[PDB]
């Protein structure tokens, strides 16, 4: 039974590969009972996209809006916005002066992603700010991001020596789902055109489905193919395919007895099936205009809260007046 | 008819060198009239001094204390303590996302300043904040501090252009006051001993300027000395020596007519003149508990409503939902 604590960035509309990996994890821990706090990291969209703030607020609200869509039950867990909990600036200020710039250089998350930054450079500092702030024991995050929690524990460990025993040393909560490839085989990003927005309508979601990458190796109708080098195939499993479906599609592909056309009315059906409940929900939730804006106050009153009684024993700890 | 800002790290007891540069120049400032903001840079205490934070309330409230010794009058300035400004870190971090790491190791005060840590790299960009925050327009410094001045004029130009116009690039309003060595020639430091206290007693004083270091050249009563070359006479300008007694040292070290002994008396009356008054400001101080907690909070609520005005437009300039 935890305290559980994760984030995502504003950067747009969100999309399958935001909820059958992250989403889906978050809505999980959620359900299991543990204490959540998930939040829009609308201060880390700043340190890449300073240069396009247009839409910030923008994207803000929409990324809360999904959260709630896809189960983020703002009853039982604490959903919020990041820039509204100004706790987090002066403890990650706060956390800058115990971390050296060339630990933060060695962050591999960094030499791998304009973005020579000072702010890109702390990216982590702000993250365990973050993270500390609620005093998380589990963070669920993609094998990318194991680093940054590694850093964190780091940073509280020294803050712990230096000071007072004030923070808890969070663990990962690794993903066992893998990551989703885009409708044309290569990595999921809006310059391929290979992205599906959860907010698609049925029209334009059956016509992704249907152009979507098969197995090149299918020529023709009686050349069998290999699920496992096929797009739709990786779609079927982030789609719940049964046992029986699933040996259906194996053994109907590989022993070209099926034809992807009706391969593909299956993962139709079946992720609809899915998102008809998210398209409702987000129905639902603009009829009540303000639901979101209650949402975002109310919940962010709540991790400030949380936040504030944190920074009460950190101030404490190293004896500032304030 | 101005807005100054300006700020000095709590490290200790001030003295001497900490008058007759910074403070009353700051004195100087309030009296002309000028909107003042001056605070206790507790938070720039910790980028150097994170090791030792057993005394840094403390040493914050007494500098407070000491600035009101001094002259600094909160019926006419604005004083108070940067921790208590939250919105000081926000800024921080904010304008952190739009100044490259490169640009932070080129400043001076960097390089020739344990120090390897992410805060002290960005010392200037939070300093920027301190002084951007209340738009001001002068800061009072010395030659050294310049640097700084002139990142943060840079930092409020490239605000004003990626987003909206917000702030006024502020200008660095230099100290004439010569730098005052210790009473021992060398450079004042805590470990040479060569300090002198505000709150020093008379008979501590009378034996301090008694033991001060002379011109060598006078081994004895009737060698002539040279008073470019003697600490007493550096001292004797700090302490306001009129004309009369400037021509009486002169004529009297150069022509050996003089003893030290009666020009170190002179100095002392000088001295004791200057320091009666905040001597006995500390008395008045001290005798009314809770005046200088009264005072710093007053006075940091309104900095502070001053700093939220400036970050509505922040923010809003940015994009950002809260
Ligand atoms: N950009 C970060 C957002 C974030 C900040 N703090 C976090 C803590 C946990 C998970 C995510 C975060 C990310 O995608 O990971
Ligand atoms: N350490 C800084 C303190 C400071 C922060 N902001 C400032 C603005 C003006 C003057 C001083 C400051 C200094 O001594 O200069
Ligand atoms: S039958 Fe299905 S798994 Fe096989 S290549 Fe066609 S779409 Fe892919
Ligand atoms: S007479 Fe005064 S100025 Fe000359 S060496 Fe002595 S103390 Fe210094």
């Known amino acids: 039974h935890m305290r559980i604590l994760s984030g995502m960035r504003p950067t747009g509309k969100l999309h399958i590969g935001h909820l059958v990996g992250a989403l889906e994890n978050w809505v999980k821990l959620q359900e299991e009972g543990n204490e959540c706090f998930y939040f829009v990291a609308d201060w880390h969209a700043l340190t890449t996209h300073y240069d396009d703030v247009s839409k910030l607020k923008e994207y803000t609200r929409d990324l809360v809006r999904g959260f709630l869509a896809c189960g983020i039950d703002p009853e ?68 990318d991001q194991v680093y940054h929690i590694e850093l964190t524990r780091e940073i509280a460990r020294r803050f712990n020596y230096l000071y007072d025993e004030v923070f808890p040393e969070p663990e990962a909560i690794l993903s066992r789902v893998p ?20 907010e698609i309508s049925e029209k ?71 998102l008809a409940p998210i398209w409702e929900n987000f129905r639902k939730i603009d009829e009540d205009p303000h639901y979101v804006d209650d949402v975002i106050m109310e919940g962010t009153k709540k991790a ?10 950190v101030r404490r700890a190293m004896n500032l007046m304030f």
Request: aromatic residues 8%.
């Open 204 to 274: 334009e979601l059956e016509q992704t489905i249907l152009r979507m990458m098969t197995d090149p190796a299918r020529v023709r109708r009686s050349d069998p193919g290999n699920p496992e080098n096929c797009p739709v195939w990786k779609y079927h499993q982030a789609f719940d395919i049964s046992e029986e479906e699933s040996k259906w599609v194996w053994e109907g592909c590989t022993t070209a007895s099926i034809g992807c056309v009706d391969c593909k009315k299956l993962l139709l059906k079946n992720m609809k099936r899915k």
């Open 179 to 198: 990551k989703l490839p885009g409708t044309d085989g290569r990595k999921m990003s809006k310059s391929y055109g290979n992205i599906i927005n959860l």
């Open 76 to 143: 039982k867990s604490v959903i919020f916005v990041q820039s509204g909990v100004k706790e987090h600036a002066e403890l990650a200020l706060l956390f800058s002066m115990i971390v050296s710039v060339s630990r933060l250089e060695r962050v591999p998350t960094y030499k791998e992603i304009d973005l020579s930054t000072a702010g890109f450079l702390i990216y982590p500092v702000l993250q365990a700010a973050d993270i500390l702030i609620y005093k998380a024991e589990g963070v669920p995050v993609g094998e």
């Open 304 to 313: 400030r809260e949380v936040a504030a009684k944190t920074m009460e024993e």
